């Protein structure tokens, strides 16, 4: 029952640069391990016995370590190099455990989001149920605000926010915003806006329609 | 080549048994030990057990010890794991690894996903999206209440693929998922095909102004 805590919780780095993420363990351990995994796909051996690369990985890759801090390094960011890595220890004992892993995201500038809002669908105007949604288009750094207005009123609690996986062209992020309100609440109002606050805006966009 | 193929999704509710399966391949299956790893999404991996078909041994986490079992049938050269009395925490992805010579596993399995719920499957109701900052303008559709996942969203089928950006599903308050699927394309037809296995709802739409 080892715990092995991984830092930091995520990072960025752009290609070229050294990365190194930690693994420290709660107490003493023989030997550690390391795992890169990417979305979609199962994890896939990097690292063995504390320092050996294992099949395909290449020799920018290195690890090493001892007692309770072991480190996985990169001598110079790739752009395929963008994945979680999991650490994993091993030692007489029974339970072989894991780290909560490292997400590697890639650096590059800031940049301002593209907003637009959408209106309710006619068809799910019939099912009694009405939802706005608000696209905030190709931005960087992932932190984006989304407060959802309706007559100026902020809302709460009736919004579902995603976000996709980094570009892997212009390493951007896309998120969305769903605002879902009974058919009966969204005729009872008229002005419906979308304020969203990001470090590349100035001040925040604010994109709306009237019902 | 050595090929590990996991059997496919399961919605089992709870209190209930699951039993999946990791077809061997490729490889003297009675030769290396296999093990199976559990992925809560946010809480990284967890070493569950591992089996060594040619003798039938197994080694288990204690937290799996009762949970778990691992089994083998060298005549199909598949591995077995069965989870009993299954709650929602045991809603996650197996995956299932070959140990190989060098002591790391240098094979995996595509894995399997486990949705732990009692509620039978729902299929989506798609609605469109009404087609300008940064100097584009963006249109697309809401695959909404949906249970369990996935839904595959392409557009025109498979037709349309620069400026597409399928979100990832949302939980909602009313415990059914539902996700956004939105292509972007500036100043200079457009059709969605929503496709969800579970319930066989394969739905296109048209997208209009
Ligand atoms: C899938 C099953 C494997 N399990 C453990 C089993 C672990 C091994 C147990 C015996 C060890 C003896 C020795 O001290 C070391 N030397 C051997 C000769 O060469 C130089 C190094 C390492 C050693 C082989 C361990 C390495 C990590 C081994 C494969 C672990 O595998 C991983 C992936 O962590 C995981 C769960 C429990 C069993």
């Known amino acids: 029952q080892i715990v092995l805590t991984q830092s930091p919780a995520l990072m960025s780095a752009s290609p070229g640069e050294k990365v190194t993420m930690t693994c420290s363990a709660s107490?003493?351990?023989?030997?550690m391990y390391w795992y890169q995994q990417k979305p979609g796909s199962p994890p896939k051996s990097w690292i063995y016995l504390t320092s050996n690369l294992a099949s395909g990985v290449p020799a920018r890759f290195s690890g090493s370590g001892s007692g309770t801090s072991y480190s996985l390094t990169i001598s110079s960011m790739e752009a395929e190099d963008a994945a979680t890595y999991y650490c994993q220890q091993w030692s007489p004992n029974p339970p072989i455990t894991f780290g909560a892993g490292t997400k590697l995201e890639l650096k590059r500038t800031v940049a301002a989001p593209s907003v637009f809002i959408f209106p309710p669908s006619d068809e799910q105007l019939k099912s009694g149920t009405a939802s706005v949604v608000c696209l905030l288009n190709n931005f960087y750094p992932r932190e984006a605000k989304v407060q959802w207005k309706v007559d100026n009123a902020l809302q709460s609690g009736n919004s579902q926010e995603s976000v996709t996986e980094q570009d892997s062209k212009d390493s951007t992020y896309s998120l969305s915003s769903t605002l879902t309100l009974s058919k009966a609440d969204y005729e009872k109002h008229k002005v419906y806006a979308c304020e969203v606050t990001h470090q590349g805006l100035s001040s925040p966009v604010t994109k709306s329609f009237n019902r | 080549q050595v090929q590990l193929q996991q059997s496919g999704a399961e919605l089992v509710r709870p209190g209930a048994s699951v039993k999946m399966s990791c077809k061997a391949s490729?490889?003297?299956?009675?030769?290396?030990?296999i093990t199976w790893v559990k992925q809560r999404p946010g809480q990284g991996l967890e070493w569950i057990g591992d089996i060594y078909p040619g003798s039938g041994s197994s080694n288990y986490n204690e937290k799996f010890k009762s949970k778990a079992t691992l089994t083998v049938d060298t005549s199909s050269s598949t591995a077995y794991m069965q989870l009993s009395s299954l709650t929602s925490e045991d809603s996650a992805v197996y995956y299932c690894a070959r140990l190989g010579s060098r002591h790391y596993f240098d094979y995996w399995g595509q894995g399997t996903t486990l949705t732990v719920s009692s509620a039978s499957t729902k299929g989506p109701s798609v609605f469109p999206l009404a087609p300008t900052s940064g100097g584009t303008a963006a249109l697309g559709c809401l695959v909404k209440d949906y249970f369990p996942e996935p839904v595959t969203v392409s557009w025109n089928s498979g037709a349309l693929t620069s400026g597409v950006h399928t979100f990832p599903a949302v939980l909602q308050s009313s415990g059914l998922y539902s996700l956004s699927s939105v292509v972007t394309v500036p100043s200079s037809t457009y059709i969605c095909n929503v496709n969800h296995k579970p319930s066989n709802t394969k739905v296109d739409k048209r997208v209009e102004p």
């Open positions: 490729g490889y003297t299956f009675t030769s290396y030990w």
């Open positions: 107490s003493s351990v023989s030997y």
